C-alpha cells in the first residue's frame, strides 16, 4: 500500500563522503595555498554547542546551544531540552519520539529530569565560558528546527558532538580550537586559538587548498566521523 516518506537520514554518510574528498585532495600540499578563496561566510552555522558538562558518571551530558537553549542527553538515552524562553520543554525518548511540556506543567515522571536539567543550566551559567560569543549565527535561528544532541564521545584530545540537524562539532581540549561541520552546506567553520573564526566550503578547500593547521584537523575529523558511523 501507501509508503509515505520514510526517513533515510544520509547526513553522516554525506559528511564522510565530503571529508574523504577534501582530504584526498591533500589541501596543504600545494605550490601556493589560497585558503581565503574557499571562505563562504553565508554558510555560517545556525547552531553550535557553546557550553557542555560531561556528568555521565551520574546523570548524562548537559549542554548549551548558542541561542541559549539547554539540553541534556541522559544516561537512559532520553533527551530533554529547555528553549531559550526558559519555560518551554521538549522531551525526546530513545526511539526519537518528541513530546512538549513546560517547567510548571509536566508529567510527574519527568520531575527528576527537569530538576537535573535546571542544575545543568545553572552550573553552566555560573562556571563556563560561551563558545562563539563573537560569532553572529545565521539569520533565522528562531525559524529553524532546534537540534538536539544525538551522539557524543570524548577522545584523549577532543569532544565530538553530533547534532540531530546533521552537524558534527569537534572541540579540541588543549588549544581550545573547534570545528563545526555541516553536511547540508558541505562546509566547515574553524574557531582558532585566538577565537577568530572562518567558514569554508569543503569543495573550495579542494580547489584552493588550506593551511596545515586546518588540514590536519580535517584528517582527524574524518577519523571521528568514521567512529560515529561505526
Amino acid at each position: 500500500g501507501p509508503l509515505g516518506s520514510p526517513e533515510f537520514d544520509c547526513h553522516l554518510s554525506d559528511m564522510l563522503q565530503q571529508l574523504h574528498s577534501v582530504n584526498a585532495s591533500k589541501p596543504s600540499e600545494r605550490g601556493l595555498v589560497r585558503q581565503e578563496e574557499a571562505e563562504d561566510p553565508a554558510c555560517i552555522p545556525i547552531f553550535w554547542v557553546s557550553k557542555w558538562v560531561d556528568y555521565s558518571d551520574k546523570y548524562g551530558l548537559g549542554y548549551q546551544l548558542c541561542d541559549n537553549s539547554v539540553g541534556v542527553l541522559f544516561n537512559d538515552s532520553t533527551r530533554l531540552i529547555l528553549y531559550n524562553d526558559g519555560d518551554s520543554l521538549q522531551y525526546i525518548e530513545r526511539d526519537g519520539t518528541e513530546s512538549y511540556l513546560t517547567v510548571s506543567s509536566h508529567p510527574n515522571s519527568l520531575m527528576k529530569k527537569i530538576t537535573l536539567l535546571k542544575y545543568f543550566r545553572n552550573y553552566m551559567s555560573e562556571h563556563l565560558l560561551k563558545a562563539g560569543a563573537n560569532i553572529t549565527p545565521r539569520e533565522g535561528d528562531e525559524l529553524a528546527r532546534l537540534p538536539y544532541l544525538r551522539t557524543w564521545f570524548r577522545t584523549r584530545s577532543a569532544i565530538i558532538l553530533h547534532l540531530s540537524n546533521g552537524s558534527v562539532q569537534i572541540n579540541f581540549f588543549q588549544d581550545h580550537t573547534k570545528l563545526i561541520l555541516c553536511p547540508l552546506m558541505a562546509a566547515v567553520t574553524y574557531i582558532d586559538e585566538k577565537r577568530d573564526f572562518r567558514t569554508y566550503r569543503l569543495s573550495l578547500l579542494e580547489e584552493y587548498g588550506c593551511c596545515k593547521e586546518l588540514a590536519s584537523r580535517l584528517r582527524y575529523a574524518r577519523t571521528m566521523v568514521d567512529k560515529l558511523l561505526s
Binding site: 565560558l129 563558545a131 570524548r154
Partner: peptide
C-alpha cells in the same frame, strides 16, 4: 569533564 571555564 567540562568545557572551558570563565
Amino acid at each position: 569533564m567540562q568545557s572551558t571555564p570563565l
